[PDB]
Design a protein around this ligand. Structure first.
Ligand SMILES: C[C@@H](CC(=O)O)C(=O)SCCNC(=O)CCNC(=O)[C@H](O)C(C)(C)COP(=O)(O)OP(=O)(O)OC[C@H]1O[C@@H](n2cnc3c(N)ncnc32)[C@H](O)[C@@H]1OP(=O)(O)O
Ligand SMILES: C[C@@H](CC(=O)O)C(=O)SCCNC(=O)CCNC(=O)[C@H](O)C(C)(C)COP(=O)(O)OP(=O)(O)OC[C@H]1O[C@@H](n2cnc3c(N)ncnc32)[C@H](O)[C@@H]1OP(=O)(O)O
Ligand SMILES: Cc1cc2nc3c(=O)[nH]c(=O)nc-3n(C[C@H](O)[C@H](O)[C@H](O)COP(=O)(O)OP(=O)(O)OC[C@H]3O[C@@H](n4cnc5c(N)ncnc54)[C@H](O)[C@@H]3O)c2cc1C
Ligand SMILES: Cc1cc2nc3c(=O)[nH]c(=O)nc-3n(C[C@H](O)[C@H](O)[C@H](O)COP(=O)(O)OP(=O)(O)OC[C@H]3O[C@@H](n4cnc5c(N)ncnc54)[C@H](O)[C@@H]3O)c2cc1C
Ligand SMILES: CC(C)(COP(=O)(O)OP(=O)(O)OC[C@H]1O[C@@H](n2cnc3c(N)ncnc32)[C@H](O)[C@@H]1OP(=O)(O)O)[C@@H](O)C(=O)NCCC(=O)NCCS
Lengths: 555, 555
């Protein structure tokens, strides 16, 4: 058993670190301001402490939200794992703050005090001891269903049970063959997911979805995403992502008739949709996209390329960020969202010739993982899009950036769920293998180094999941815009770490394509790149918001 | 330019950390001692601080050996990069010692003194500042040839130049297709490598190779390995590995007639060889292997399984660790090295029947990377091996564990070179992409976060390379047995970290199979698993040796 004082000691130390973190943010905010406003040039100059402060903030908030969750219903497993991560987070955040304080020339006496604190040393010796980590690992093997048991009502809990059963029965048997043969998602699996309601979780009931009309709770979308992603990230969990992004764009900027026509159809996968933002020369820099839209009678003709457009072959509609104004001096103000319609194709390339002479061609890009929808290089040549298919119609012209960003918040929240499911798959596989594999006379699980790795893996998984559900509740209340990107950043890198470590526990087995953890590892690597690359999120969403809020508070 | 006094400040801080690390090794050795001798049970109990002490020792030695190498000829790049890594290592090792000192219940007042040293804060602000890291990045782009330019000698530098030219012109254009189609290494490439001498670098001249007759200098082996590995880990850099292990085993335990017969043939690739140690139930635990050899007239019948046997299809001879003695409690003393001869096969499976009816079948194991040679599950069924193919003939029976371990010393040295070559490839790829890709109006290189990542990648590559060459010089003087495992552990994990970061710098491009860094990433993941998995080496070679040395010194 852990000391009875551990939770209080952890909370006190995290609050001390939060004070130091907030002091560094204000110090940095002053070094980035010129004339009462953040300065783009100084922000670029100060990227290194900005990046480190974004990561320190993610780890701090993961530890706090996890610790705040401990109540009378928390499982015995989770109580131990939450404290493990919180003690680790104390040292992680302290380490970053020492580097940040040095770079910003701040006094570090208080940081030295925290490191020499006798309570921190006692926590290392009790919560992070080799026997305590080993005991937590044995407890996980005894009751794996208690790992990450976040608070849900019975309804959400039964939705989880149904989708875990479906993912295990129907998705998991197909996951390896889809990856190794780079197959498009079978129609049978698409039909099943459609009838489970997987395309309408983000869409209000009044537009033919299943989300209640008066509210915006993402927790249902998150729980289904997690269950499906555990079985297959790309072939099941990621089918939710495109409707999430495009429903949010249509709700942000569509007219009533566009919301009525499109959202009802997207909810039943007819048509399936794909997101066409990224271009060969622009991915992080959405404001700079150049795919050209030129007005003709009754609509637009599009010319240029898109790339990495996932599911573009099978999709019947594309959400295309289009530069509709030739004046490049407008930046993002020259962008509009256009709905390009196309036939549905099952292959790795397609060549669609329109009536008026336009064309759209596509060729899939082979990837190390994330396989099953394909991601395509697209070429638009005088491709026609009618006026009606401009999201927002006439008033949507020049506002495509705002509606894209609205979609991205939902996408990143959902991507935290995707990372969570991949982590749970990797964790359970490592726990199972450690129990079954014998080395030097005993099950691998019985060795203290194995216990420590498994408990640290689980602690990170669990802290990521409690943070994910916390941000979901923030979004349900109209808050947490920045925090969706923070938990995306935290969970997606955590998926890399957890999958790497699970693979290692497997030994050579972890490297074989016939062993699922090899696939979880190459799949997880994409999570920190797409949907907002880690650095872009840390600098231009998380770091920017932290500094803006410090400026205002001290104005 | 960095401060002039930085080198002495860093040296003084590393010397303090070494003292604390040596005290912790003594403390741990006492904890593991029962009756004047290390106890297996206590060692198992204390795995966690053993693992952490092994890692801290590797980071310490990498920093020390790099610093010790700075002289008048050291490039301007390397003088910077070596200080970068050395300052990082001070904080890495200090951090590990905090965990170790708490776990062993040691007084930690001196660790607090080091963390609060004003010399350390000044090193952070001068050597690890955003501007100094960015400066080093731009200098690397101007002078890429200065990165990691270890003192070599004219003859060795010339050999490096020649193999780099060949690797760029002949191997690199083939590497993507071999990986993406899981192709056997093409014979045209094998023949060209054969005639460059790639199979005879560790075979003495008097036995038909190119190595010195009196000395055992591994630096030529390393430098060719690095250059080939930069172009392809599995299709070129790894062709040196099997002859390095087998020739070393034959030099250790073969009879004069076996050395004369086998080494001259191996040196020209007639036959190619493959190493058959690992079994389905045993990889780390070589002493436990159970493939069975039963005596018969004129030789041995082999029965059982091997697995992960790389290049087993194409190789005409397998070096097979065989349990020739029925008393399994002999552990390693019941093992012998038997040379199993077979036709050459280029496919993913093979079925060989001897004229007497004995059988050897093989089926390749598909992997996420390291593709080209294939790794096979092998089944031996009454497979005959003549008396003359026991390494050592009669006197080699029961001695095969010793000769295998001797082989693995050279293998792990060679594998540190393989890791070095992959790191150089990933680093140069990341440097190039950062100069070419523009984001938000400027080349990616111009952003301080990019400079900091590139410079930290390069400082780790360089410290690993200077350590690799230092250990090679130790092997040349009959020392460095344990350090071969230590530098393999350090360099192989470092390849994971460098390739993950290089891929991140490429963004989505890094995930495409038509982009080399995606391949370097999945290849580098193998390095910390095979040739002695990181945990096995940390615990049973590095940690054990450190603890044994501390016992012997206190008696
Ligand atoms: C489908 C998935 C793959 C898969 O799963 O298969 C994918 O991969 S799919 C592609 C994902 N692609 C990205 O992830 C793009 C990442 N890159 C960005 O996201 C932005 O480009 C960054 C963060 C760089 C900032 O760009 P930035 O600095 O240039 O723009 P900014 O922040 O300064 O603001 C400009 C104006 O938009 C207003 N604005 C800002 N945020 C919001 C918001 N949330 N809602 C409404 N308005 C907003 C702002 O208030 C300004 O308004 P105004 O000043 O004009 O009035
Ligand atoms: C080809 C490549 C892939 C590719 O590239 O395509 C590969 O992947 S290929 C497969 C790689 N597979 C490994 O890498 C095995 C890892 N696992 C081991 O290496 C050992 O199993 C460990 C480290 C666990 C220790 O095993 P352990 O603890 O049970 O044995 P131990 O240390 O206690 O020593 C017992 C007796 O061997 C003597 N001894 C020890 N070391 C040496 C030495 N260096 N030279 C001579 N004698 C030695 C020792 O002095 C004892 O002698 P005695 O006391 O009996 O007289
Ligand atoms: C499998 C896969 C599927 C995808 N699916 C889709 C899809 O369906 N629809 C779609 O539109 N896109 C999709 N993407 C694109 C994804 O969103 C982008 O890859 C992501 O936005 C990063 O953009 P980029 O690749 O152009 O990298 P870049 O923008 O070129 O940036 C490269 C590197 O520099 C960093 N960086 C960027 N800006 C700065 C800066 N100012 N300072 C310092 N560092 C910076 C980035 O974090 C990154 O590490 C997919 C990508 C992949 C690999
Ligand atoms: C692509 C590939 C190519 C290979 N090429 C060859 C070849 O050519 N010839 C050959 O003989 N072998 C080869 N190998 C085998 C490789 O050397 C082994 O995988 C390696 O020795 C690890 O053994 P293992 O896979 O059985 O893992 P295990 O021994 O089962 O161990 C699993 C995990 O537990 C850890 N562990 C082991 N023991 C302990 C302990 N006592 N305490 C705590 N942790 C422990 C290990 O570090 C590992 O992380 C290859 C493997 C791969 C993947
Ligand atoms: O009949 P025998 O004459 O009494 O002797 P065995 O059948 O038991 O074996 C004959 C030889 O093979 C050896 N031998 C037998 N089984 C062996 C094994 N599993 N491994 C190695 N050597 C073995 C014996 O030591 C003996 O060696 P030697 O001629 O040098 O003296």
């Amino acid at each position: 058993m852990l000391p009875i004082t551990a939770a209080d000691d952890v909370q006190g130390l995290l609050l001390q670190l939060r004070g130091l973190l907030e002091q560094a943010i204000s110090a940095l905010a002053s070094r980035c301001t010129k004339g009462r406003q953040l300065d783009a040039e100084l922000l670029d100059l100060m990227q290194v402490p900005t990046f480190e402060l974004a990561w320190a903030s993610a780890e701090l908030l993961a530890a706090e939200r996890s610790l705040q969750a401990i109540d009378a219903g928390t499982s015995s497993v989770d109580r131990r794992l939450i404290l493990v991560f919180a003690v680790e987070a104390i040292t992680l955040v302290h380490s970053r703050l020492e580097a940040i304080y040095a770079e910003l020339d701040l006094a570090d006496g208080t940081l030295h005090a925290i490191a020499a604190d006798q309570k921190l040393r006692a926590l290392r010796r009790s919560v992070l001891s080799s026997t305590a980590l080993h005991d937590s690992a044995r407890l996980m093997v005894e009751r794996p269903e208690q790992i990450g048991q976040v608070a849900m009502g019975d309804e959400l809990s039964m939705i989880e049970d149904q989708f875990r059963r479906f993912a295990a029965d129907t998705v998991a048997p197909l996951a390896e063959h889809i990856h190794r043969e780079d197959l498009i998602i079978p129609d049978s699996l698409l039909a099943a997911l459609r009838d489970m309601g997987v395309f309408g979780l983000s869409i209000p009931e009044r537009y033919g979805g299943s989300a209640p009309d008066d509210q915006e709770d993402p927790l249902t979308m998150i729980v289904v995403t997690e269950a499906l992603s555990q079985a297959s990230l790309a072939a099941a969990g990621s089918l939710i992502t495109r409707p999430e992004i495009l429903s949010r764009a249509l709700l942000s900027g569509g007219t009533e008739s566009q919301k009525q026509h499109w959202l009802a159809r997207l909810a039943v996968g007819d048509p399936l949709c794909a997101i066409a933002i990224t271009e060969p020369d622009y991915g992080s820099d959405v404001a700079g996209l150049t795919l050209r839209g030129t007005p003709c009678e009754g609509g637009w003709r599009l010319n240029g390329a898109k790339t990495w457009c996932t599911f573009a072959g099978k999709a019947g509609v594309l959400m295309v960020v289009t530069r509709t104004n030739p004046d490049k001096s407008l930046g993002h103000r020259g962008l509009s969202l256009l709905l390009a319609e196309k036939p549905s194709y099952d292959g790795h390339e397609f060549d669609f010739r329109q009536p008026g002479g336009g064309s759209l061609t596509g060729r899939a890009i082979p990837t190390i993982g994330y396989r099953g929808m394909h991601s395509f290089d697209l070429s638009f040549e005088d491709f026609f899009v009618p006026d009606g298919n401009v999201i927002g119609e006439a008033q949507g012209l020049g506002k495509g950036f705002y509606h894209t960003m609205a979609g991205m918040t939902g996408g990143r929240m959902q991507t935290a769920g995707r990372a969570s499911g991949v982590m749970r798959a990797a964790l359970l596989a490592g726990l199972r293998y450690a129990t079954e594999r014998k080395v030097f006379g005993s099950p691998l699980l019985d060795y203290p180094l194995t216990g420590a790795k498994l408990t640290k893996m689980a602690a990170r998984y669990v802290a990521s999941r409690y943070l994910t559900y916390s941000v979901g509740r923030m979004l349900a209340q109209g808050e947490g815009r920045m925090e969706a990107s923070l938990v995306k950043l935290f969970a997606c890198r955590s998926a890399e770490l957890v999958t790497r470590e699970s693979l290692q526990i497997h030994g050579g087995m972890g490297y074989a394509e016939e062993v699922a953890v090899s696939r979880y590892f190459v799949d997880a690597r994409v999570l920190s790149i797409f949907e907002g690359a880690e650095e872009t999120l840390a600098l231009k969403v998380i770091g920017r918001s932290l500094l803006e809020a410090a400026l205002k508070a001290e104005a």
